[PDB]
Structure formats: structure tokens, C-alpha cells
Amino acid sequence: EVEQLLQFHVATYMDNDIAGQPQALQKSGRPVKAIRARLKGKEGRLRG
């Protein structure tokens, strides 16, 4: 249970849009802004 949780945190640190499992959440309730989400979409590093 503890090793899988280290795998989990390292995964959602890089990509928090993994299909088929719940997103990592901030205490405010909104999803964590992972590095992958920083680069994609209209406002990310590349298009924005």
C-alpha cells in the first residue's frame, strides 16, 4: 500500500489526467495542476 502510493504521487505529479482512475485533488477540491496540463491547451506554455 505504501509503495503503490509513492508510484501514485510520482505519476500525478507529471500527469494528472490518467484515464480510468480518480484525479489527485487539492484540499480546495479542485484538481492538481500537473506538468502535462501546464503545456497543453490554449493557455499552456506552447500555445499561450
**Strand-pair partners of 25:** 31
Site string for RNA, 29-48 (x = CB under 7 A): -x------------x-----
Site string for DNA, 6-45 (x = CB under 7 A): -----------x-xx----x-xx-------------x---
- Which three cell numbers, joined as nine digits, stand for 42? 490554449
Q: How many chain residues interact with DNA (CB under 7 A)?
A: 7
Reference 11, options 30, 38, 29, 36; nearest CA is 36
**Least distance in Å: CB of 26 to RNA?**
10
Spatial CB neighbours of 36, under 8 Å, sequence gap ≥ 6: 14, 15, 16, 17
Residues in the site for DNA, rule: CB under 7 A?
17, 19-20, 25, 27-28, 42
